[PDB]
Amino acid sequence: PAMGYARRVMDGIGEVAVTGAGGSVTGARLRHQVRLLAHALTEAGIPPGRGVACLHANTWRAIALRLAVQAIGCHYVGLRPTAAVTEQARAIAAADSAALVFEPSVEARAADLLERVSVPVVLSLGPTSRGRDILATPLRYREHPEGIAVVAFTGTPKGVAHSSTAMSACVDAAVSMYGRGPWRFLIPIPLSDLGGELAQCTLATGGTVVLLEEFQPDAVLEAIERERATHVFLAPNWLYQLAEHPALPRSDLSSLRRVVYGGAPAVPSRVAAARERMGAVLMQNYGTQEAAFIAALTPDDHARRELLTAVGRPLPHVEVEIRDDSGGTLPRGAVGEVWVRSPMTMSGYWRDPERTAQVLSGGWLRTGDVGTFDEDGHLHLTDRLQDIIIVEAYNVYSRRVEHVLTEHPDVRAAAVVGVPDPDSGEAVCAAVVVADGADPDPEHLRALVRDHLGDLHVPRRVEFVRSIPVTPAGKPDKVKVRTWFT
Numbered sequence: 001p002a003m004g005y006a007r008r009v010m011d012g013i014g015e016v017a018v019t020g021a022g023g024s025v026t027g028a029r030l031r032h033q034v035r036l037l038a039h040a041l042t043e044a045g046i047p048p049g050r051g052v053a054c055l056h057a058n059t060w061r062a063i064a065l066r067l068a069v070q071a072i073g074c075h076y077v078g079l080r081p082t083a084a085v086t087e088q089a090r091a092i093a094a095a096d097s098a099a100l101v102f103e104p105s106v107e108a109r110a111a112d113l114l115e116r117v118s119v120p121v122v123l124s125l126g127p128t129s130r131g132r133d134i135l136a137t138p139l140r141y142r143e144h145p146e147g148i149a150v151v152a153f154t155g156t157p158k159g160v161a162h163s164s165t166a167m168s169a170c171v172d173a174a175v176s177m178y179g180r181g182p183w184r185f186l187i188p189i190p191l192s193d194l195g196g197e198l199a200q201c202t203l204a205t206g207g208t209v210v211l212l213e214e215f216q217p218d219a220v221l222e223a224i225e226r227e228r229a230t231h232v233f234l235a236p237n238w239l240y241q242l243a244e245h246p247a248l249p250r251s252d253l254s255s256l257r258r259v260v261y262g263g264a265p266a267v268p269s270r271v272a273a274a275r276e277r278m279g280a281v282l283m284q285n286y287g288t289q290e291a292a293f294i295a296a297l298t299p300d301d302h303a304r305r306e307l308l309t310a311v312g313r314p315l316p317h318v319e320v321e322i323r324d325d326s327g328g329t330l331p332r333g334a335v336g337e338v339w340v341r342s343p344m345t346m347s348g349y350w351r352d353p354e355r356t357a358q359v360l361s362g363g364w365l366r367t368g369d370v371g372t373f374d375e376d377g378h379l380h381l382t383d384r385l386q387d388i389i390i391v392e393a394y395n396v397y398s399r400r401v402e403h404v405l406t407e408h409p410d411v412r413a414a415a416v417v418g419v420p421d422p423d424s425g426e427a428v429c430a431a432v433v434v435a436d437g438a439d440p441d442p443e444h445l446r447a448l449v450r451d452h453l454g455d456l457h458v459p460r461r462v463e464f465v466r467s468i469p470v471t472p473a474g475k476p477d478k479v480k481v482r483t484w485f486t
């Protein structure tokens with residue numbers, strides 16, 4: 001039964017559940033809030049099969065809200081703070097939302113949204129103009145008819161539907177990666193997506209969530225020492241900022257058992273630097289919206305240069321194959337599409353079987369990534385499938401070219417893209433972020449690529465840029481970079 005997940009999380013909640021700016025929230029008090037919010041949502045006439053769209057910051061009540069939405073047999077639809085109003089609004093409609101719950105601090109955006117899309121019930125976490133204040137008896141669970149816990153939105157936004165079973169499996173995966181708890185887990189990523197699942201993993205294992213509204217290196221350092229945090233999750237760029245910060249050696253981070261980073265391709269040289277400066281606590285995570293968790297790179301893995309280009313070994317119960325355009329399994333060392341079968345994979349795109357069937361086949365999920373396994377069974381990603389540069393029936397993997405460029409001491413980041421060319425097939429182009437106050441020779445960089453990879457991989461055009469543009473999700477916006485060179 002689908003209510004098993006929400007109950008698992010509830011069941012786990014320990015003495016102290018959340019800490020933040022304002023101070024601590026006991027297990028008791030959080031449990032109470034779930035019951036409260038659950039009852040209020042039930043009473044407001046929200047039926048089991050439907051979604052509850054939620055717009056909030058990184059607050060402890062938002063932790064309760066997700067759990068309440070799931071407990072009452074609904075599917076949580078976390079509205080991403082970085083997303084545009086038109087994307088958020090499309091998401092509310094497509095997810096079959098029976099409600100919009102929002103926090104006062106984002107009433108402006110809530111109003112904006114409600115001009116664009118209609119919704120039966122509009123509720124708010126505290127007094128507000130545009131909605132009814134929920135905050136004014138045991139937890140009464142209902143079952144989602146189709147067992148969905150979460151719908152999270154991605155060309156054009158698809159809604160990834162994750163089962164209650166899949167989210168339960170994620171707890172087991174989290175334990176297998178992060179240690180037995182309790183964890184004091186610092187979460188500065190938004191509670192609307194992975195952040196919110198990590199909070200649930202943390203609660204379920206008897207730990208304490210430590211919330212920050214945003215990432216600042218000073219604040220994270222301070223928080224780790226002050227709350228004696230054991231775990232934290234960072235975007236790769238945040239890792240680099242934290243590791244390179246001047247106050248790091250001054251700070252006491254002896255409490256850390258895991259500094260977790262992922263969600264975007266890592267710069268090997270910057271990771272190596274972080275591994276040196278931060279010690280044996282570095283762990284990388286690889287997943288996708290469709291796949292959830294796939295692989296992790298341990299702190300001991302980070303002590304082999306050869307593995308700094310890897311995502312790591314697949315997690316327990318995660319089957320991975322490398323496959324050709326046809327669909328046949330390739331040998332170790334060969335490069336092809338990464339396919340995944342696991343208890344954590346999506347059920348499908350919400351109310352879209354046509355698109356789902358292009359991505360699932362035989363219980364296997366097409367990640368959209370391309371890569372290969374090494375002799376010791378670590379997965380190495382060479383590219384997003386859309387980012388491969390084809391020259392006359394040869395594959396140039398843009399990440400391999402970036403790795404070489406970024407190894408140069410005067411280069412911090414690189415985005416390599418192809419643009420079409422009749423005489424070269426496609427022309428390799430590189431946007432490069434330079435170090436500090438450095439001024440490397442484009443030709444040295446071309447020469448470096450030429451020595452390591454060969455003639456075809458060498459970028460014709462090299463542009464120095466202040467930063468690599470990112471998507472709202474925080475990934476390299478390689479469609480933007482592509483436009484710079486057309």
Ligand SMILES: Nc1ncnc2c1ncn2[C@@H]1O[C@H](COP(=O)(O)O)[C@@H](O)[C@H]1O
Nearest residue numbers: 262263264265266285286287288289369
């Ligand atoms: N730890 C990681 N290392 C490298 N790439 C990653 C990592 N985590 C996520 N990604 C990339 O992000 C993609 C999934 O993002 P999304 O489609 O937004 O869920 C994957 O296909 C990967 O290429």
Ligand SMILES: CC(=O)c1nc(C(=O)O)cc2c1[nH]c1ccccc12
Nearest residue numbers: 194262263285286287288289292293
């Ligand atoms: C583990 C990880 O880094 C990760 N990345 C993404 C991504 O989109 O890059 C997505 C997920 C990741 N872990 C997950 C667990 C459950 C559901 C979704 C995810």
